[PDB]
């Protein structure tokens, strides 16, 4: 039986380190007419805009590539006890699964 510290040591998210400038492949699970809701698998879905090139082949279940900056967008404003999560992630589109 494996201990949980061993699983944290060998999890891919621990191997990620910094959340800035990381190339992560993700999967689109919901289609809004200009908005792509992409579950890259970490914690939250990110929202991207449909690009002007090859915009027809971004559908449900499509795998894309992302460059992560913040895994969860969250900030403090004055007069707030707790931070303000947006319940999203920040990532931009590079392309879709070049194979």
Partner 1 sequence: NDLRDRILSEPLKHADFFNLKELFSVRSLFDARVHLGHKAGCRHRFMEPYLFGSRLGQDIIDLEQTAAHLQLALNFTAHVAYREGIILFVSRHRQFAHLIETTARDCGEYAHTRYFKGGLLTNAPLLLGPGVRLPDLIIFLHTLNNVFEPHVAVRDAAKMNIPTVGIVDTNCNPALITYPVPGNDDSPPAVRLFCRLFQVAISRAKEKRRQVEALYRLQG
Partner 2 sequence: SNEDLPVPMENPYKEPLKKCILCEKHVDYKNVQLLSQFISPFTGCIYGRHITGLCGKKQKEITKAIKRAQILGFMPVTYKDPAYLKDPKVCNIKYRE
Partner 3 sequence: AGSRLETVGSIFSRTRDLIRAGVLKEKPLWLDIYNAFPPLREPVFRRPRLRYGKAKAAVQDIFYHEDRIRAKFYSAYGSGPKAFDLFNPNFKSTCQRFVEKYIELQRLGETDEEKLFVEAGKALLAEGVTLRRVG
Contacting residues toward partner 3, per CB under 8 A: 8-9, 12-18, 21-25, 27, 40-42, 65, 81
Return d(Cα 36, Cα 56) in angstroms, integer. 12
User: What is the smallest separation between the CB atom of 21 and partner 2, expressed in angstroms?
Assistant: 11
Contact residues toward partner 1 (CB under 8 A) are 2, 4, 7-8, 11, 13-14, 17-19, 29, 39, 42-44, 71-72, 74, 76, 82-83, 85, 87
Residues of the chain with a following break (C to N over 2.5 Å): none
Return d(Cα 69, Cα 22) in angstroms, integer. 7
User: What is the smallest separation between the CB atom of 33 and partner 3, expressed in angstroms?
Assistant: 27
Q: For residue 10, how far is the Cα from the chain centroid? A: 20
């Amino acid at each position: 039986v494996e201990s949980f510290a061993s699983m944290l040591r060998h999890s891919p998210l621990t191997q990620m380190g910094p959340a800035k400038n990381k190339l992560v492949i993700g999967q689109i699970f919901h289609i809004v007419e200009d908005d792509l809701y992409i579950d890259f698998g970490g914690k939250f879905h990110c929202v991207c805009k449909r690009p002007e090139v090859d915009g027809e082949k971004y559908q449900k279940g499509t795998r894309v590539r992302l460059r992560l900056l913040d895994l969860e967008l969250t900030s403090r404003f004055l007069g707030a006890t707790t931070d303000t999560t947006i319940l999203e992630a920040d990532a931009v589109l590079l392309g879709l699964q070049e194979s």
